[PDB]
Amino acid sequence: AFKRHIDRLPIIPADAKKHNVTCHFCIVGCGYHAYTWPINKQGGTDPQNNIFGVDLSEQQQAESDAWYSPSMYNVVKQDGRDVHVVIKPDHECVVNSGLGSVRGARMAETSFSEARNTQQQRLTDPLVWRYGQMQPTSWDDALDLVARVTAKIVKEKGEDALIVSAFDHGGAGGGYENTWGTGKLYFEAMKVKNIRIHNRPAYNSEVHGTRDMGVGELNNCYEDAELADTIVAVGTNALETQTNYFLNHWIPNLRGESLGKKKELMPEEPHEAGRIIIVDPRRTVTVNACEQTAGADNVLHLAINSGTDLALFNALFTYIADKGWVDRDFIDKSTLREGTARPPLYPARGVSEANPGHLSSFEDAVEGCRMSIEEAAEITGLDAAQIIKAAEWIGMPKEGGKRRRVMFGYEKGLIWGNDNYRTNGALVNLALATGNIGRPGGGVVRLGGHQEGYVRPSDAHVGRPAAYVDQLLIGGQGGVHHIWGCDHYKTTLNAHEFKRVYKKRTDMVKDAMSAAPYGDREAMVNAIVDAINQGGLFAVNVDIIPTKIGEACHVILPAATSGEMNLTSMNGERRMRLTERYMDPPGQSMPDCLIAARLANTMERVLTEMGDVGYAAQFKGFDWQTEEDAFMDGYNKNAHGGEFVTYERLSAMGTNGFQEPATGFTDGKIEGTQRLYTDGVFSTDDGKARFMDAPWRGLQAPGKQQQKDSHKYLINNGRANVVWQSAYLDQENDFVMDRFPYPFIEMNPEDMAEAGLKEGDLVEIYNDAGATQAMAYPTPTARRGETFMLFGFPTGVQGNVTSAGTNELIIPNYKQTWGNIRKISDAPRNVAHLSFKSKEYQS
Amino acid sequence: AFKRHIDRLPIIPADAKKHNVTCHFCIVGCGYHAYTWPINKQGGTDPQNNIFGVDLSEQQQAESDAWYSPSMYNVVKQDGRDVHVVIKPDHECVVNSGLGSVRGARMAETSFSEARNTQQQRLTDPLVWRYGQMQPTSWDDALDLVARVTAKIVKEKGEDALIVSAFDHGGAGGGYENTWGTGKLYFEAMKVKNIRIHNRPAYNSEVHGTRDMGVGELNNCYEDAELADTIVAVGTNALETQTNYFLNHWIPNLRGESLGKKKELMPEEPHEAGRIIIVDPRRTVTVNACEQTAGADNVLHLAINSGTDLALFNALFTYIADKGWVDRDFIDKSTLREGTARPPLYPARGVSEANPGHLSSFEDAVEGCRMSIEEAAEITGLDAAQIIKAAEWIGMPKEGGKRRRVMFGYEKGLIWGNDNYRTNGALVNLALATGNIGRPGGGVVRLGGHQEGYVRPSDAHVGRPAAYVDQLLIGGQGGVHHIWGCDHYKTTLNAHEFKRVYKKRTDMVKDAMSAAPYGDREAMVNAIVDAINQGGLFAVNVDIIPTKIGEACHVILPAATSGEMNLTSMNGERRMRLTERYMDPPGQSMPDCLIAARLANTMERVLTEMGDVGYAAQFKGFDWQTEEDAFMDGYNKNAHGGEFVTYERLSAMGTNGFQEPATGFTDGKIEGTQRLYTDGVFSTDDGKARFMDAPWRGLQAPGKQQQKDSHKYLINNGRANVVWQSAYLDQENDFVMDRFPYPFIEMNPEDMAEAGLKEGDLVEIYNDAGATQAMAYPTPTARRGETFMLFGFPTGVQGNVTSAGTNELIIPNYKQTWGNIRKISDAPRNVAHLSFKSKEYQS
Amino acid sequence: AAGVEYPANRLANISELTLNEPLDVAYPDEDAAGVLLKLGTRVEGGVGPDGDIVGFSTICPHKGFPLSYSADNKTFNCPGHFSVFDPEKGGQQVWGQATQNLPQYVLRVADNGDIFAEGVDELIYGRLSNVL
Amino acid sequence: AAGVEYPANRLANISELTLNEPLDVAYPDEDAAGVLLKLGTRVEGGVGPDGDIVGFSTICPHKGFPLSYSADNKTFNCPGHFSVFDPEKGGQQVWGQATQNLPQYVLRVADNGDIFAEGVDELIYGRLSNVL
Ligand SMILES: Nc1nc2c(c(=O)[nH]1)N[C@H]1C(S)=C(S)[C@@H](COP(=O)(O)OP(=O)(O)OC[C@H]3O[C@@H](n4cnc5c(=O)[nH]c(N)nc54)[C@H](O)[C@@H]3O)O[C@H]1N2
Ligand SMILES: Nc1nc2c(c(=O)[nH]1)N[C@H]1C(S)=C(S)[C@@H](COP(=O)(O)OP(=O)(O)OC[C@H]3O[C@@H](n4cnc5c(=O)[nH]c(N)nc54)[C@H](O)[C@@H]3O)O[C@H]1N2
Ligand code: FES
């Protein structure tokens, strides 16, 4: 086991500088503070000599505010000087109440420190491919090159020859400043159509279904998970992936601790400890923790067949409607009352690829969705009794005939699962039918992934469906690719093929560049463009580390991330905070919004020099000198309620921030919105929610059924608690990499014995899409025939075995993946030290 | 400026475990000790509680043994546990007398430490190119792939299809165990002809001239530098490149501190403080320090025209011979008297490419070399007076008629300089003529680079001249390349062209591998071989870090270096020491000798399986389990006097070791040889040394005269004191990279003004061979038109502008390079913190 | 004083321990609870004739709840937020919320069977220095 | 304490410094020689109205010979083994044998012009703790 051998830590002194910090990482947006103080000072164990006013010569008790782990301490540059830093979770933040996950608690230790040698992989200088290798250079040189090639390609072939891949998310590697900066560059200065998002290969919404119905996906508050009678958790492994939401809000409900709260806010109705329905093919640690906290009788784990959620929800909707377990007044008052006729190709297809499902009235939707319990039990593999029980935990009135309060929460098991549009809609149908939107203890919400921080110009020009960018690239189209804060080599679908082609096309441009004179920049530009005209690709990567896709790029531009800059984002409750900068960017690294502005400025210069003065003038409006300038040009001018929000006002509100949208500013507080749709007026032109007539149609995405039928195992995929995303930071964190040097593939021990595998064996997963590697981890809770591989991982990429298959709106169907498995090596010595024991807590 | 902010160091306790350590790095081989102790223990300041017996609560005085700098402290794994380590220079070692250079003194800080996060770039696992990226794997998998491909290729195309590049040196990345392991594999089990050495592109000697004359190049001892009347230092920048030899032995001669000892060991002649002739086109810090110590009157800096050494030496030899300042008895007794005939193509060409110069008697060599003072002044640019003065300082008898004692020392300014074979012989003529070999105060020696630790089977099959391996590779020949401990991307000649072609050929194999199924290992091997047959190359890298050339390789195998293994080598005086293992190899890394043995075993297994049992059997004799087994099989059985030497015996001798060859073992002491040739019997069949008739013939290597004529600046090249080699460790050492983020190019400040360059400007150096970059460093001591670029450096590789020109024996003529210079960028912001002040100490 | 000075403290005698049953202990003072545990197989940091005796903090490095030991499993388990630690693999967090593997004692068995502790390899919950 | 406790020691008054002439001081005790130096141009670690006052150890971090100051170059120079340090650039070793750039004082000027030292950024030659 990895052990730091750090025996003591510097003590935060009483006069340390305090900074408000939201967690860099997941959607929960846990509150923290960063305390910094000079390198040659320290605090003392006496109360007056430390930030806590506690005597630190004594053992603190459980849940103390007056302790931090070594992963919470570092030394960092701040205004050119080394300072101590502690980044510690905030006890007074209502999101986390002082909980810090395994990820957030390592913010300090995954910061850049020269003094303590952490994250020495961080990028410090612009890099250009020249003289046969990547070489460091100045900003002026690298941006000049990027702009010259970009401007020439776009002037000769149009903006369609510019391909963009960029984050659209919040938190570190995103945020309002940074989504605005990039958005303004590509959607205001230009009209880039061939743009994709960091997690999906087209410029689309993950949840077109709920949005078209009039229900924005983040409509409740985290208190609603405390107040619900029943939590319905679909395709979420919340303990691992929305950890402190689960621990600080769901668990109190399951344990009965929120009963006093429920009784106070909701006096005219009965209350019991929360029950929870978990819809996931796999038994997770989240299932286990629910059982241990609530008791097995209060947890309904519906272990459906992969990809059959839509059948379950349509049966539940059918049963609840037929029992009349619905909110008749909500339906009459708030939902669309005149249904409309099915499109001609229904039920197999919608009116076009833009509209895979049919929006209508409650009654029409019930008849369109109609599916018996027995049919749903066949498709899902669930027992009829389990489905009936679930309908009861959702719809059946409480004693006195009071409405059951149900929070419906869903994440990537649904969004990246079968038939995204219809399955999203079918779940929303349930919440609408039961009046569980805009009221306490309700919601039909994304549980989320990253924090959210999106503000951009109109994307009307991208179309719907939008372009399938990876398929353009694989097919030899496009000329220049700008990549901002995503690494398709680890995380795209059909990743093996993507990599083969990307390498070849970028190699053309590299071979041309190594043979041309650099000091003659016009010759270099011309040689690059000739290679592009032959089918090559010129690629520019904006990131904070050397990425996998970066190994194919020609220019690398170093970014500064959250904490090295000021940054705004909102959590899964819409709670907007300001993370206040507490350290300096490594080397010459620069916030993404400012990269974008500098690139715009360079585009203006070069286009002017080329004589296209009208095109050049489109790149104005980027005189920003600090990230607050982008905040003010973006969020402050364009968000609803934006006038009310400034960095100074956000700062005054601390880690609790306010819930968007802002409705006013009075007495130093931004006034927010605790829940959406409280008046029952929905996000449609007439104010009514629509239901969705959304019949089951099997595995919707191309090739999926054939993939299932022709391979041995389900290769389910997703997150581990210990790993953040593609391990971009974690790869230089021994605590993480000592635990999993390879990605795990959870396998049932009988399956392993049948395939001749032993624990720790390195195995190849393969199918029609490609091949990859993983380490067999024996998992007694896995069902026979069903495996789970950690996604996004640099030492074995799961996406290599995902097909190119998407829905009509170009949503990637990563979860429905099947393949074969065969041994590559006996368990290597570098996994001899690992525990292969169960991840489930035992009381 | 970089500052570690380490305010105190753990104290070595009295009971720490002591290990003998030779410096990893240069030829001088300074002695150190590694003291290790448990992570949870420490010494104290009372004499009883520390290894020094000193009261460490008191400030120590200059030159104290009871101090170490932060770079000498780390925490490392030893036998699986974290231990404190201090690696500090040995006061009792006669080589260094407690001096530790800027490189040696950072051995600890550049060791691998998970606890203190140093050198996290170190390789821990075998890596194989598969699934679109490099992936970690087991030794069994990686070795099997390497062997199957290697065996298939060799079986189908012969051993000539296998190309090898390997270290031949001592110290870290070499040594007797490692050179034996690799040599037994390629020269015993196989007869690999297409092999090159880490610093030159064929399997030749650097100094065939002196060797053919009978004068092995390490013939003296370091005391001789203290004892000479005159040191002649040719093409060496000893203060920076042989630092502690210079400081601990040359300096005391120049200061007159050795006078007492001179008088003592050689009474019967007069003695003055040593004088020094430095033959170097550039004024270096070495020249400066010499003036500062001896007075400018006792330093003669012969700032010759680049490449004109041979003309100077022939004029010296002619002048000294004509005056009769020669040791006539030595010439008569110990040198060749045979008459001979110049070969037919003399003087332009020798008898063949194997023999560029003509070996002869004293008298025939004088007539053949004959050059007037006026002709040599014209060629070298020196004044006639300077050449006459040098002749006097070398040959003029002292006050009794007593022979003047002269140490001739030479390094890469000669060896990588013009007409290596003739120039080497011409300098050896001077030492032969003056009887300054095998006597106190004499020698004609390499000053050296790495330590030495060569023992291998016969290389007779390679030929002479041997194959020019880079030209084979660049010309599309060969199939598989094994690369051991060298990085041609940074350090070969004509490196731009090399990188271009190397990338293309290896990419062909990458593209095949990415598209074939790895889990069917036979299909993978076939896809590889097919790609090889089409002109590709399969490349395997054995190293301790991810290298530049490693970015083109298909398999990477992780080595353990000195200190993580036991290791033997000798220094520039032939002082052989054992470095005793004090820490564990990182991860699954393995000593090179054991990698070679495991690869031999795999080759045996694989060839047996293919049915070539006779060939398989050639790979026996590699049952080694520890590096000491390779020492016993190699050095102990093959070196002269090897039977006297074992680990246990070396260990008892300490950091003083003994001088090779061993002549016996008595009283627990390996007995050795202080100087070679003390009896006048030389390394030829008749025991007579030969002179060389070596006439001046201009710039010998092809293209060099044209390169000079058609470009504006000399691009001289070489070392910096602070930087070790290609910065393989140093690139993750902030003290080094904070000083030089780009390689410097030393430029005369008027040349800078005339080219519009300022300090710190990023400039492109370019010519017919290629282009590269460097940072302009104003250097008032540079001559106009003469620049000097740091070689080998990852952020701007000087080799890119070296032509493919070699002499007849394939010695690379790196020093004679000319090119043009133009600005790439104004000084980047990442060099704003740099001092650009003179590197010369001021009194 | 550059590092923490750990006391060498007697915790028990080899005789006192039964296979697979923790024995409560405290190190490096009475306020830092932990256990000795004899595991029946040679393991990392394990002392005694069989190399199977380990000592660990039993206070969770996440938020400080006390860890229970499951004999069936040979794991430590946290009722706070469901962390699991493997004392047969150096206290590796099998799954959990701590950013630390379980602090493990450096043990020495004296010539008479007495078991001393003289260091810990990680920062114990609730103290900013392991020796207070 | 986890870190070294530096004393805040008064070294001189700004009025005592003449441009480009070192003033001998000692910090953090009387056996650790150093200088204050006013450079006439704002520089790294420089204090005072013009940001041009610096303090360095004048004992060579290689083998402890005392450094001389060249006023024409503004460098420290070591007669031991030819090392050169640049006080206009944070004590950067321009060329030399130390593995450390020159230990520099963390300085503070008080309202009366008194210059205080409260830290040092590298390990001073000949002591294993900067505060003995
Ligand atoms: N520790 C950690 N937490 C994270 C992240 C991280 O990298 N690490 N990343 C964040 C991001 S960006 C995101 S998007 C979120 C993702 O959060 P989640 O969606 O909660 O996490 P996943 O592991 O992708 O998938 C959740 C579950 O979907 C299940 N599943 C698979 N197929 C199906 C199906 O057909 N139907 C249903 N109903 N379930 C199915 C899987 O078995 C799995 O347990 O997590 C965020 N949180
Ligand atoms: N700091 C440090 N020391 C090292 C090394 C290191 O990387 N760093 N590497 C080691 C190795 S492997 C080696 S081989 C040695 C090399 O040691 P040296 O040979 O001393 O070092 P170089 O800097 O290559 O070249 C020395 C001198 O040759 C001069 N020179 C250039 N052209 C000519 C010429 O035509 N004639 C003459 N006479 N001189 C010329 C240069 O101006 C330069 O000052 O150093 C070793 N020591
Ligand atoms: S206190 Fe142990 S898991 Fe949180």
Domain ranges of chain A: 12-122+561-587+640-673, 123-204+451-560+588-639, 205-450+674-698, 699-834
Pocket test for ligand 3, best of C57, C67, C94, C97 (most atoms within 8 A of CB): C97
Paired with A128 in beta bridges are A135, A555
Largest CA distance in chain D: 44
Collapsed DSSP state (helix, strand, coil) of residue C47: strand
Q: Write the single-letter amino acid at A781.
A: T
- Tokens found for residue A161: 């020859």
Please say whether the beta carbons of B496 and B771 come within 8 A. yes
Q: Write the single-letter amino acid at A815.
A: K
Please say whether the beta carbons of B283 and B306 come within 8 A. no
Q: Is A59 on the interface with C (CB under 8 A)?
A: yes
State residue A719 phi and psi, 5-degree precision.
Answer: -90, 150
Nearest CA in chain A to C97: A102
Kindly list the strands in the beta sheet with B406-410, ordered across the sheet, starting from the edge strand earlier in the chain: B299-302, B275-279, B230-234, B406-410, B444-446
For chain A, the distance separating the N- and C-terminal CA atoms, rounded to the nearest angstrom, is 24
| Other residues' Cβ atoms within 10 Å of the Cβ of residue B379 | 20
Residue B238 CA to ligand 2 center (angstroms) comes to 8
CA gap A122, A450 in Å, rounded: 21
How far does the CA of residue C40 sit from the closest CA of chain A (Å)?
17
Q: Is C2 on the interface with D (CB under 8 A)?
A: yes
| Other residues' Cβ atoms within 10 Å of the Cβ of residue A669 | 13
CA gap A139, A144 in Å, rounded: 8
Please say whether the beta carbons of A562 and A175 come within 8 A. yes
How far does the CA of residue A116 sit from the closest CA of chain C (Å)?
16
Say whether A839 and C68 touch across the interface (CB within 8 A).
no
CA dihedral A690, A695, A697, A700 (to 10 degrees): 10
Nearest Cα neighbor of B391 from B320, B310, B309 is: B320
Nearest Cα neighbor of B324 from B215, B403, B439 is: B403
CA gap A557, A545 in Å, rounded: 10
Residue D68 marked as a ligand binder: no
- Tokens found for residue B749: 């400040």
Collapsed DSSP state (helix, strand, coil) of residue C51: coil
Collapsed DSSP state (helix, strand, coil) of residue B332: helix
- Tokens found for residue B48: 């009883």
Paired with B408 in beta bridges are B232, B444
- Residues 6 or more apart from A258 whose CB is under 8 A from it? A226, A227, A252, A274
CA gap B550, B539 in Å, rounded: 8
Which one of the listed residues C81, C82, C110, C132 is annotated catalytic?
C81
Distances, alpha carbon A756 to alpha carbons A749, B287, B302, B666, in Å: 10, 70, 74, 60
Collapsed DSSP state (helix, strand, coil) of residue A664: strand
The residue contributing the CA closest to ligand 3 atom 3 is C81
Q: Could you tell me how many residues make up chain D?
A: 132
Please say whether the beta carbons of B369 and B193 come within 8 A. no
Residue at token pair 């990477």: B556
How far does the CA of residue C34 sit from the closest CA of chain D (Å)?
24
Nearest Cα neighbor of B711 from B749, B764, B674 is: B764
Please say whether the beta carbons of B823 and B761 come within 8 A. yes
Nearest Cα neighbor of B599 from B553, B639, B559, B547 is: B559
Q: Is A305 on the interface with C (CB under 8 A)?
A: no
- Residues 6 or more apart from B512 whose CB is under 8 A from it? B527, B528, B530, B531, B536
Distances, alpha carbon B750 to alpha carbons B24, B780, B821, B839, D54, in Å: 40, 9, 14, 18, 32
Residue C68 CA to ligand 2 center (angstroms) comes to 65
CA gap B58, A750 in Å, rounded: 68
CA gap B28, B10 in Å, rounded: 29
Paired with C93 in beta bridges are C85
Residue B242 CA to ligand 2 center (angstroms) comes to 9
Question: Which active-site residues of D does the annotation give?
Answer: 62, 81
Residue A60 CA to ligand 3 center (angstroms) comes to 15
CA gap B613, B269 in Å, rounded: 69
| Other residues' Cβ atoms within 10 Å of the Cβ of residue B476 | 12
DSSP string of A410-440, one letter each residue? E-HHHHTSSSHHHHHHHHHHHHHHTT-SSST
CA dihedral B68, B70, B73, B75 (to 10 degrees): 160
Kindly state the DSSP code that residue B405 receives in the 8-state scheme: P
- Tokens found for residue A39: 């390198």
CA gap A309, A381 in Å, rounded: 11
The residue contributing the CA closest to ligand 2 atom 31 is B413
Q: Which ligand is nearest to the CA of A285?
A: 1
- Tokens found for residue A694: 């959304």
- Tokens found for residue A522: 């016009």
Q: Which ligand is nearest to the CA of A24?
A: 1
How far from the centroid of its chain's Cα atoms is residue A526's Cα?
39
CA gap A225, A253 in Å, rounded: 7
Q: Is B292 on the interface with D (CB under 8 A)?
A: yes
Q: Is A9 on the interface with D (CB under 8 A)?
A: yes
Say whether A42 and D2 touch across the interface (CB within 8 A).
yes
Domain count, chain D: 1
Residues 766-795 of B with CB under 8 A from D: none
- Tokens found for residue B695: 């006439």
Q: Which ligand is nearest to the CA of A727?
A: 1
Residue C15 marked as a ligand binder: no
Q: For D51-78, b where at least 16 C-beta lie within 10 A, e where not — what string?
A: ebbbbbbbbbbbbbbebebeeebbbbbb
Query: Which chain A positions have a beta carbon within 8 Å of B795's beta carbon?
Result: 135-136
Say whether C119 and B10 touch across the interface (CB within 8 A).
no
The residue contributing the CA closest to ligand 2 atom 24 is B718
For chain B, the distance separating the N- and C-terminal CA atoms, rounded to the nearest angstrom, is 24
C62 has catalytic annotation: yes
- Tokens found for residue A252: 């109190």
Domain assignment of residue D82, given as a range: 1-132
CA dihedral C61, C64, C66, C69 (to 10 degrees): -10
Say whether B7 and D131 touch across the interface (CB within 8 A).
yes
Please say whether the beta carbons of B771 and B797 come within 8 A. no
Q: B828: cis peptide before it, omega within 30°?
A: no
Which one of the listed residues C57, C62, C67, C101 is annotated catalytic?
C62
Reduced 3-state DSSP string for chain D: CCCCCCCCEEEEEHHHCCCCCCEEEECCCCCCEEEEEECCCCCCCCECCCCCEEEEECECCCCCCECEEECCCCEEECCCCCCEEEHHHCCEEEECCCCCCCCEEEEEECCCCEEEEEEECCCCCCCCECCC
Give the ranges where A481-520 is alpha helix by DSSP (H). Answer: 488-491, 495-515
CA gap A485, A403 in Å, rounded: 45
- Residues 6 or more apart from A631 whose CB is under 8 A from it? A176, A177, A180, A566, A568, A647
Say whether A839 and C94 touch across the interface (CB within 8 A).
yes
- Residues 6 or more apart from B590 whose CB is under 8 A from it? B139, B557, B558, B559, B560, B598
CA gap B325, B648 in Å, rounded: 48
CA gap A590, A7 in Å, rounded: 35
Nearest CA in chain B to C118: B40
Which of B40, B46, B77 should one mutate to test binding to chain C, selecting the residue with the greatest count of C CBs within 10 A?
B40
Nearest Cα neighbor of B474 from B53, B769, B819 is: B769
Nearest Cα neighbor of B514 from B19, B93, B131 is: B131
How many Cα atoms are found within 13 Å in the side-chain-facing hemisphere of A283?
18
Q: Write the single-letter amino acid at A267.
A: P
- Residues 6 or more apart from B709 whose CB is under 8 A from it? none
Q: Which ligand is nearest to the CA of A243?
A: 1
Nearest Cα neighbor of A139 from A585, A562, A503 is: A585
Q: Write the single-letter amino acid at B463.
A: G
Q: For B323-361, b where at least 16 C-beta lie within 10 A, e where not — what string?
A: eebbbeebbeebbbeeeeeeeeebbeebeeeebbbbbbb
- Tokens found for residue A779: 């998992």
Residue B193 CA to ligand 2 center (angstroms) comes to 29
Say whether D2 and A9 touch across the interface (CB within 8 A).
yes
CA gap A349, A356 in Å, rounded: 6
Residue A454 marked as a ligand binder: no
User: Solving technique for this entry?
Assistant: X-ray
CA dihedral B741, B747, B750, B755 (to 10 degrees): -70
Burial of B753 (0-12, 13-18, 19+ CB in 10 A): exposed
- Residues 6 or more apart from A76 whose CB is under 8 A from it? A36, A82, A83, A85, A111, A112, A113, A582, A583, A584
- Tokens found for residue B808: 């007849």
Say whether C2 and B42 touch across the interface (CB within 8 A).
yes
Nearest Cα neighbor of A100 from A65, A75, A76, A74 is: A65
Residue C82 marked as a ligand binder: no
Residues belonging to the binding site of B for [3Fe-4S] cluster are 23, 26, 30, 32, 101, 103, 244
Nearest CA in chain B to A731: B120
CA gap A766, B308 in Å, rounded: 64
Please say whether the beta carbons of A498 and A513 come within 8 A. no
- Tokens found for residue B830: 């990442």
Distances, alpha carbon B337 to alpha carbons B688, B691, B695, in Å: 9, 10, 20
Kindly state the DSSP code that residue B713 receives in the 8-state scheme: E
CA gap A802, A815 in Å, rounded: 8
Q: Which resolution, in Å, applies to this structure?
A: 1.9
| Other residues' Cβ atoms within 10 Å of the Cβ of residue A526 | 16
* Angle between helix A373-380 and A384-395 (nearest 10): 110
Paired with B36 in beta bridges are B17, B85
Query: Which chain C positions have a beta carbon within 8 Å of A838's beta carbon?
Result: 73, 84, 94
- Please indicate whether residue A413, judged by its CB atom, sits closer than 6 Å to ligand 1: yes
- Please indicate whether residue A309, judged by its CB atom, sits closer than 6 Å to ligand 1: yes
CA gap A481, B785 in Å, rounded: 43
